[PDB]
A paper describes a structure:
Each patient was heterozygous for a different mutational variant of the TTR protein (V20I, G47E and V122I, mutational sites refer to mature TTR). The third patient is a man (TTR V122I) who was diagnosed at the age of 51 years. He also showed carpal tunnel syndrome and received a heart transplantation three years after diagnosis. For the three fibrils we obtained spatial resolutions of 3.18 Å (V20I) 2.37 Å (G47E) and 2.99 Å (V122I), based on the 0.143 Fourier shell correlation (FSC) criterion. The other two mutations (V20I and V122I) are seen in our 3D maps and occur within the fibril cross-β structure. Yet, they exist in different chemical environments: while residue 20 is part of the N-terminal fibril protein segment and located at a buried and hydrophobic position, residue 122 is located in the C-terminal fibril protein segment and affects a solvent-exposed position. Both mutational changes are chemically conservative and insert not more than a single methylene group into the mutant protein, all suggesting that the two mutations are not stabilizing or destabilizing to the fibril structure. All three fibril samples contain both mutant and WT TTR protein. A superposition of the three structures shows that the fibril protein folds are virtually identical. The backbone root-mean-square deviation of all 92 resolved backbone Cα atoms was analyzed with Chimera25 and found to range from 0.5 Å to 0.7 Å for the three structures.
Systemic ATTR amyloidosis is an increasingly important protein misfolding disease that is provoked by the formation of amyloid fibrils from transthyretin protein. To investigate the relationship between mutation, disease manifestation and fibril morphology, we have determined the cryo-electron microscopy (cryo-EM) structures of several ATTR amyloid fibrils, which were isolated from the amyloidotic tissue of patients with hereditary ATTR amyloidosis. Based on cryo-EM, however, we find essentially the same fibril structure in all patients, demonstrating that the mutations do not necessarily lead to different fibril morphologies. Each molecular layer consists of two discrete density regions that correspond to two ordered segments of the fibril protein: an N-terminal segment, extending from P11 to K35, and a C-terminal segment that spans from G57 to T123 of TTR protein.
Author numbering:
A (entry chain D), B (entry chain C), C (entry chain B), D (entry chain A), E (entry chain E), F (entry chain F): 11 to 35, 57 to 123
The structure:
């Protein structure tokens, strides 16, 4: 008897992000997983990933160059921060 | 008997993002997974991924160049932040 | 007996995004997965992905160039943030 | 007996996005998946994907050039954020 | 008898991020895991990961260069910090 | 009889991040793990990870160069710090 009870009774106005999981039981491999449930990615950069079997195997001249030079701006007043009866403001 | 009960009773006006999962049981491979349930990606860059089997195998001259130089702006006052009875404002 | 009950009773006006999953049981391959349920992608860039088997196998001269230089702007006051009885405003 | 009950009783005027899934059981391949259920993609760019078997196999001179330089603007006051009894306004 | 009870009774308007998990039982491989439940990644950079079996095996001349030089700014007043009855403001 | 009870009764408006886990029972490999539950990564850089079996095996001349020189700024007034009845402000 696996019984899970979450926030069963709520009187009022709560701000919430419920996450409930119940389980009863050649290069990169994954299995039976829960990923990114509430994941938040901002300005995420992947350049060279899982290129392959035998990549650049013989006589490979390679010049790699990452030039991260940008007037970039990110302004998040509430990230994954539920809020009740409040005042949120990005004043810019 | 697998019983899961979530937010069964709500009196009022809550702001919510419910996520409930119940389970009763050549280069990149995945299986039996839950991904991106509420995932939020902003300004995400993948350049060279899973190129293939034998990519650039023989005598490969390669010049790779990433020039991330941009007047880019991202303004999110409430990301995955449910809010009840409040004031949200992006004043720009 | 797999019983799942979510938000069964609601008195009032809640703002919600319900997500409920019940399960009773050559380069890139995937199987039996749930993806992008509420995924939100903004300004997402993939340049070179899964090119193929034997891509650029012999004597390949390659010049790759990413020039991300743009006056781009993204303004989202409420992303995946349900809101009840509130005031949301993008004032720009 | 797989019984799933969601939002069975609603008294009032809630704003909601219900998502319920019940399951009782050469380069890129996928199977038995649920994708893009509520996915929201904004300004998403794929340049070179799944080119094919043996693409650019012999003596290939390639110049690739991405020039992302645009006065582009995206303004969404409520993305996947259901809202009841509120005031949403994109004032620009 | 595995009984889990979380926030069963709420009188008022709390701001919360509930996370409840109940379990009753060639290069990189993973299995049976829960990842990114509420993970928040900001300005995360992966350059060379899982290149492959036999990458640069013979006579490989490689010049790698990361130049992280950017006027980048990130301003988050509330990251994973739920807040009730308060005033949050990014004044810039 | 494994009984777990968390925050069962709440009178008022607390700000909380509940995390409850109940368990009743070729290069890098992992199994049966919970990771990133509330993990927050800011300005995290991985350059050369899991390159592969036999990477740079014979006669490899390699020049690696990381130049982290950026006018980067990160301002988070509340990271994983729930707050009730308070005033949070990033004044810049």
């Amino acid at each position: 008897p696996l019984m899970v009870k979450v926030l069963d009774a709520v009187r009022g106005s709560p701000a919430i992000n419920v996450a409930v999981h119940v389980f009863r039981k050649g290069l990169t491999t994954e299995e039976e997983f829960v990923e990114g449930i509430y994941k938040v990615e901002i300005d995420t950069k992947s350049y060279w990933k899982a290129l392959g079997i035998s990549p650049f195997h013989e006589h490979a001249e390679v010049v790699f160059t990452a030039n991260d030079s940008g007037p970039r701006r990110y302004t998040i007043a509430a990230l994954l921060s539920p809020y009740s009866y409040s005042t949120t403001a990005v004043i810019t």
